[PDB]
């Protein structure tokens, strides 16, 4: 197992700066990944998930755009402590990278979005996570689908990194951690899922961009 310092500086940082996408497989190991899976399944079973929403809701149903159901987790809720461990581990990696990811100064993040595509061909249309400057600079996703066969069950995250001659197809594999720049460099989509698909996302904020975004929100722009 690589320490956070080496994984951040010798792998995540150069991969993010060269490609804008970075995959770390077998991030937490099978035992912890299974416990996270159980916590997510209990959120699902107890009706905590609600339809995923969009930054700007207009005339169309949210379900025309994203077919997932989600809840937000801080990591200290009863029954969510292993999700909290995951979040702490993501945070430790970012802290060890901080200052070397582009020109960003990362001060904070969202709560964790625990999301489920409930099979049935649901997915997420082509989108950019942060197209207009809301502060988000890095998207971090942890996948927890044991026994996923994407050739049958679909659910690939396809990213279209700007300037590259190939797309990036990310299978939502158990215990996989993914980072990518949240801005318009990385439009992406979740292809239809034909089995229940779970993932946990946090977004990290750039300090200056997030402060500007909060100013715009608080002044009504």
């Amino acid at each position: 197992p690589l320490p956070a310092l080496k994984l951040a500086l010798e792998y995540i940082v150069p991969c993010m700066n060269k490609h804008g996408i970075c995959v770390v497989d077998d991030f937490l190991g099978k035992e912890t990944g299974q416990q996270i899976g159980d916590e997510v399944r209990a959120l699902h079973d107890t009706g905590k998930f609600t339809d995923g929403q969009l930054v700007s809701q207009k005339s169309d149903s949210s379900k025309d755009i994203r077919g997932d159901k989600i809840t937000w987790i801080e990591g200290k809720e009863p029954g969510c402590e292993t999700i909290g461990l995951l979040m702490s581990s993501m945070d430790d990696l970012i802290r060890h990278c901080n200052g070397k990811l582009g020109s960003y100064k990362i001060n904070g993040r969202t709560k964790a979005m625990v999301a489920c595509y409930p099979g049935n061909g649901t997915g997420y249309v082509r989108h950019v996570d942060n197209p207009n400057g809301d502060g988000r600079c890095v998207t971090c996703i942890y996948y927890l689908n044991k026994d996923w066969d994407a050739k049958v069950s679909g659910g690939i995250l396809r990213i279209f990194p700007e300037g590259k001659a190939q797309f990036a197809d990310i299978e939502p594999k158990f215990d996989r951690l993914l980072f990518f720049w949240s801005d318009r460099r990385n439009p992406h989509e979740v292809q239809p899922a034909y089995a229940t698909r779970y993932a946990i996302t946090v977004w990290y904020f750039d300090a200056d961009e997030r402060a500007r975004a909060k100013v715009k929100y608080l002044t009504g722009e």
């Binding site: 929403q53 901080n98 904070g108 969202t110 950019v128 996570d129 197209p131």
Partner: peptide, 19 residues
């Protein structure tokens, strides 16, 4: 097209965690 109509919602105030 307003790309914010496709972007995943986050809370804009009250809910940011500080690292």
């Amino acid at each position: 097209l307003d790309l914010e109509t496709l972007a995943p919602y986050i809370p804009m105030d009250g809910e940011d965690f500080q690292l």
